[PDB]
Motif scaffolding. Structure first.
Motif, PDB file in Angstrom:
ATOM      1  N   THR A   1      -2.515 -10.105 -11.306  1.00 55.92           N
ATOM      2  CA  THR A   1      -1.547 -10.088  -9.826  1.00 55.92           C
ATOM      3  C   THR A   1      -2.407  -9.280  -8.871  1.00 55.92           C
ATOM      4  O   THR A   1      -3.126  -8.371  -9.219  1.00 55.92           O
ATOM      5  CB  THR A   1      -0.383  -8.883 -10.048  1.00 55.92           C
ATOM      6  OG1 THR A   1       0.228  -9.225 -11.216  1.00 55.92           O
ATOM      7  CG2 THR A   1       0.650  -9.266  -9.027  1.00 55.92           C
ATOM      8  N   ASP A 347      -9.682  -4.197 -11.500  1.00 59.52           N
ATOM      9  CA  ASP A 347      -8.949  -5.040 -12.810  1.00 59.52           C
ATOM     10  C   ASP A 347      -7.702  -4.277 -13.512  1.00 59.52           C
ATOM     11  O   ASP A 347      -6.856  -4.814 -13.605  1.00 59.52           O
ATOM     12  CB  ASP A 347     -10.109  -5.363 -13.760  1.00 59.52           C
ATOM     13  CG  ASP A 347      -9.425  -6.052 -15.161  1.00 59.52           C
ATOM     14  OD1 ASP A 347      -8.936  -7.295 -14.873  1.00 59.52           O
ATOM     15  OD2 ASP A 347      -9.794  -5.546 -16.299  1.00 59.52           O
ATOM     16  N   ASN A 350      -4.799  -4.503 -10.892  1.00 60.30           N
ATOM     17  CA  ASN A 350      -4.099  -5.949 -11.170  1.00 60.30           C
ATOM     18  C   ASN A 350      -3.500  -5.870 -12.259  1.00 60.30           C
ATOM     19  O   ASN A 350      -2.319  -6.665 -12.689  1.00 60.30           O
ATOM     20  CB  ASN A 350      -5.326  -7.055 -10.962  1.00 60.30           C
ATOM     21  CG  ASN A 350      -5.869  -7.123  -9.898  1.00 60.30           C
ATOM     22  OD1 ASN A 350      -5.485  -6.281  -9.011  1.00 60.30           O
ATOM     23  ND2 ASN A 350      -6.929  -7.813  -9.818  1.00 60.30           N
ATOM     24  N   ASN A 351      -3.876  -5.345 -13.774  1.00 60.47           N
ATOM     25  CA  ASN A 351      -3.172  -5.400 -14.757  1.00 60.47           C
ATOM     26  C   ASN A 351      -1.886  -4.268 -15.085  1.00 60.47           C
ATOM     27  O   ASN A 351      -1.395  -4.257 -16.073  1.00 60.47           O
ATOM     28  CB  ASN A 351      -4.100  -5.810 -16.056  1.00 60.47           C
ATOM     29  CG  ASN A 351      -4.597  -6.909 -15.770  1.00 60.47           C
ATOM     30  OD1 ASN A 351      -4.129  -7.830 -16.474  1.00 60.47           O
ATOM     31  ND2 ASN A 351      -5.844  -7.143 -15.190  1.00 60.47           N
ATOM     32  N   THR A 352      -1.828  -3.304 -14.294  1.00 66.75           N
ATOM     33  CA  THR A 352      -0.645  -2.447 -14.365  1.00 66.75           C
ATOM     34  C   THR A 352       0.358  -2.506 -13.298  1.00 66.75           C
ATOM     35  O   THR A 352       1.062  -1.648 -13.142  1.00 66.75           O
ATOM     36  CB  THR A 352      -1.256  -1.083 -14.405  1.00 66.75           C
ATOM     37  OG1 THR A 352      -1.991  -0.882 -13.186  1.00 66.75           O
ATOM     38  CG2 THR A 352      -2.042  -0.594 -15.533  1.00 66.75           C
ATOM     39  N   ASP A 354       3.026  -4.026 -12.937  1.00 63.81           N
ATOM     40  CA  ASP A 354       4.306  -4.201 -13.471  1.00 63.81           C
ATOM     41  C   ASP A 354       5.110  -2.773 -13.762  1.00 63.81           C
ATOM     42  O   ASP A 354       6.243  -2.615 -14.104  1.00 63.81           O
ATOM     43  CB  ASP A 354       4.527  -4.929 -14.676  1.00 63.81           C
ATOM     44  CG  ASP A 354       3.623  -4.485 -15.994  1.00 63.81           C
ATOM     45  OD1 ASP A 354       2.936  -3.393 -15.936  1.00 63.81           O
ATOM     46  OD2 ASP A 354       3.505  -5.318 -17.020  1.00 63.81           O
ATOM     47  N   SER A 376       1.273  -0.170 -19.853  1.00 58.76           N
ATOM     48  CA  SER A 376       0.700  -1.083 -19.008  1.00 58.76           C
ATOM     49  C   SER A 376      -1.135  -0.636 -19.146  1.00 58.76           C
ATOM     50  O   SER A 376      -1.967  -1.303 -19.065  1.00 58.76           O
ATOM     51  CB  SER A 376       0.751  -1.646 -17.880  1.00 58.76           C
ATOM     52  OG  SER A 376       2.201  -2.189 -17.944  1.00 58.76           O
ATOM     53  N   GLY A 377      -1.187   0.674 -19.162  1.00 57.02           N
ATOM     54  CA  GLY A 377      -2.658   1.156 -19.075  1.00 57.02           C
ATOM     55  C   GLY A 377      -2.773   2.761 -19.044  1.00 57.02           C
ATOM     56  O   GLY A 377      -1.637   3.436 -19.152  1.00 57.02           O
ATOM     57  N   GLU A 408     -16.326  -5.735 -20.423  1.00 56.51           N
ATOM     58  CA  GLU A 408     -15.125  -6.607 -20.392  1.00 56.51           C
ATOM     59  C   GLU A 408     -14.811  -7.185 -21.724  1.00 56.51           C
ATOM     60  O   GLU A 408     -15.813  -7.188 -22.603  1.00 56.51           O
ATOM     61  CB  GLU A 408     -15.176  -7.445 -19.069  1.00 56.51           C
ATOM     62  CG  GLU A 408     -16.397  -8.372 -19.241  1.00 56.51           C
ATOM     63  CD  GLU A 408     -16.263  -9.247 -17.603  1.00 56.51           C
ATOM     64  OE1 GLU A 408     -16.234  -8.599 -16.817  1.00 56.51           O
ATOM     65  OE2 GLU A 408     -16.177 -10.475 -18.009  1.00 56.51           O
ATOM     66  N   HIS A 442      -6.272  -1.337 -20.409  1.00 57.24           N
ATOM     67  CA  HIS A 442      -5.238  -1.926 -20.063  1.00 57.24           C
ATOM     68  C   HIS A 442      -4.758  -2.767 -21.062  1.00 57.24           C
ATOM     69  O   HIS A 442      -5.594  -3.209 -21.828  1.00 57.24           O
ATOM     70  CB  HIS A 442      -5.132  -2.500 -18.527  1.00 57.24           C
ATOM     71  CG  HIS A 442      -6.021  -3.586 -18.248  1.00 57.24           C
ATOM     72  ND1 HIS A 442      -5.706  -4.762 -18.894  1.00 57.24           N
ATOM     73  CD2 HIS A 442      -7.217  -3.663 -17.698  1.00 57.24           C
ATOM     74  CE1 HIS A 442      -6.827  -5.612 -18.680  1.00 57.24           C
ATOM     75  NE2 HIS A 442      -7.762  -4.777 -17.863  1.00 57.24           N
ATOM     76  N   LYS A 443      -3.446  -3.135 -21.077  1.00 58.25           N
ATOM     77  CA  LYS A 443      -2.992  -3.928 -22.210  1.00 58.25           C
ATOM     78  C   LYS A 443      -3.436  -5.615 -22.276  1.00 58.25           C
ATOM     79  O   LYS A 443      -3.489  -5.856 -23.357  1.00 58.25           O
ATOM     80  CB  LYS A 443      -1.213  -4.104 -21.702  1.00 58.25           C
ATOM     81  CG  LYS A 443      -0.835  -4.900 -20.563  1.00 58.25           C
ATOM     82  CD  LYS A 443       0.587  -4.875 -20.681  1.00 58.25           C
ATOM     83  CE  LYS A 443       0.892  -5.567 -19.326  1.00 58.25           C
ATOM     84  NZ  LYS A 443       2.507  -5.648 -19.271  1.00 58.25           N
ATOM     85  N   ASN A 444      -4.113  -5.948 -21.187  1.00 56.37           N
ATOM     86  CA  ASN A 444      -4.674  -7.238 -21.403  1.00 56.37           C
ATOM     87  C   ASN A 444      -6.445  -7.239 -21.495  1.00 56.37           C
ATOM     88  O   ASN A 444      -6.932  -8.173 -21.160  1.00 56.37           O
ATOM     89  CB  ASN A 444      -4.306  -7.858 -19.952  1.00 56.37           C
ATOM     90  CG  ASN A 444      -2.838  -8.473 -19.908  1.00 56.37           C
ATOM     91  OD1 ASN A 444      -2.413  -8.830 -21.114  1.00 56.37           O
ATOM     92  ND2 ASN A 444      -2.561  -8.320 -18.603  1.00 56.37           N
TER      93      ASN A 444
END
Ligand SMILES: [Ca+2]
Ligand SMILES: [Cl-]
Length: 448
Positions: A1, A347, A350-352, A354, A376-377, A408, A442-444
């Protein structure tokens, strides 16, 4: 996101188009704030961009065709363009513009002397006790437009609407404090649809014109954030940041555009020495990590050039993408948006996106902090002189994660390029962070 945008200060349209394709899009940056694309006065100083001559898209950044090409390419890469719009004034004195147009004595190709307020000078003491002088007099001799005039409003609105037709998705309203909020409301009634609009209002308190007056016309730059963040990282305790935001008296999160530094305050205009910039190296890394991980405001990463202490100097004589060579990280373009810790922070944000809450805040009462964004992180900063080895509680699933500030996850999710962080079966992490370093997971970016 998409959650973060960037200011590619003084970058030409060709360098921006390429930057969108090769880096900004793949890395997830939401948009790019470009330097004023309209016709401005000649000269090499960076501030010549802030003295308009006309609204023709012929500037130091390039011509109309190159500008349109940049918008198309960035858009295809999934990155928006925000245009720095001069709504308060036109150039001072006389001379020639970058498209060949002449001007002088408040006479321009699109404005007559009657389209400006009568000349008067804005004195420093006016800010504290005379809103009339602040909004009707001249900012350092710049011709002050009569923004209440239907002709002036139609003219600026026509420019904004043409940019939207080309594909521009947002606008930065430069010097908004010097324009009555009611003039801006009238202006917006002439703008098509609802583009992203953020207004530059410098309000540190005790001003006759306040930032809160602009909350109904769009987002507002929260300058207290830059100043306080910088002051806490340099002279305070990171532990104080546990309630950073509205709790410190800042405007609502959903209305604020925030940053560690911007093009003006990194040069001493609207910010003192406590403002953290690229010159501070690892201090800058850590401050950006906090801002990008903390859920307040809409952040914009700064992207500068080494001005060698010359605050009037324009940018480098060489392009960023120079014959297969990237002119970043040295004495030309600094490219902070590419720095490992900063892109890793983007990064993370963008990944947290939510979970906008700060969970399980931990600190050592001074310069060591850690907090999560729910499951999420999680992240931690160590700004002490000794290793941070505390065990902290998280809401994350057990397993192995890449410290995204240092590397990464690979395409097949089997390895990381930097260090690995372990979340134990009970959700805890046994930290191991050296002095002046940080970690963010983070989770991703979870292994295997
Ligand atoms: Ca004005
Ligand atoms: Cl700004």
């Amino acid at each position: 996101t998409p959650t973060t945008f960037v200011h590619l200060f003084e970058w030409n349209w060709q360098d921006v188009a390429q930057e969108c394709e090769q880096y900004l899009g793949p890395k997830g940056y939401a948009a790019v704030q470009v330097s004023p694309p309209n016709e401005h006065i000649t000269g090499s100083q960076w501030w010549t961009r802030y003295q308009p001559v006309s609204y023709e898209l012929q500037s130091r950044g390039g011509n109309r065709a190159q500008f349109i090409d940049m918008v198309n390419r960035c858009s295809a890469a999934g990155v928006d363009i925000y245009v720095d719009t001069l709504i308060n004034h036109m150039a001072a004195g006389s001379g020639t513009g970058t498209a060949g147009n002449s001007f002088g004595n408040k006479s321009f190709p699109i404005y007559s002397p009657q389209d400006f307020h009568e000349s008067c000078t804005i004195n420093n003491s006016d800010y504290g006790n005379d809103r009339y002088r602040v909004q009707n007099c001249e900012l350092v001799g710049l011709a002050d437009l009569d923004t209440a005039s239907n002709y002036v409003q139609n003219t600026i609105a026509a420019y904004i609407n043409d940019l939207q037709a080309i594909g521009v998705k947002g606008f930065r309203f430069d010097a908004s404090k010097h324009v009555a909020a009611s003039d801006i409301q009238s202006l917006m009634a002439k703008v098509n649809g609802s583009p992203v609009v953020f207004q530059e209002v410098i309000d540190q308190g005790g001003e006759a014109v306040g930032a809160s007056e602009y909350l109904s016309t769009g987002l507002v730059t929260e300058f207290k954030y830059s100043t306080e963040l910088g002051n806490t990282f340099r002279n305070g305790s990171l532990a104080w940041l546990s309630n950073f935001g509205e709790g410190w008296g800042f405007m609502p999160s959903s209305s604020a555009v925030v940053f560690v530094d911007n093009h003006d305050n990194q040069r001493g205009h609207g910010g003192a020495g406590n403002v953290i910039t690229f010159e501070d190296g690892r201090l800058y890394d850590l401050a950006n990590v906090f801002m990008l991980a903390y859920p307040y405001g809409y952040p914009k990463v700064m992207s500068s050039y080494d001005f060698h202490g010359d605050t009037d100097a324009g940018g480098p004589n060489v392009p960023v993408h120079n014959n297969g060579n990237l002119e970043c990280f040295a004495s030309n373009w600094k490219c902070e948006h590419r720095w490992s810790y900063i892109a890793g922070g983007v990064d993370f944000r963008n990944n947290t996106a939510d979970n906008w809450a700060v969970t399980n805040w931990w600190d050592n009462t001074n310069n060591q902090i850690s907090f999560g964004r729910g499951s999420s992180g999680h992240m931690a900063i160590n700004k002490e002189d000794s290793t941070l080895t505390a065990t902290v509680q998280t809401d994350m699933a057990s397993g192995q994660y890449c410290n995204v500030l240092k590397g990464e996850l690979s395409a097949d999710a089997k390895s990381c390029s930097g260090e690995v962080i372990t979340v134990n079966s009970d959700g805890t992490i046994n930290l191991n962070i050296g002095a002046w370093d940080a970690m963010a997971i983070h989770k991703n970016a979870k292994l295997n």
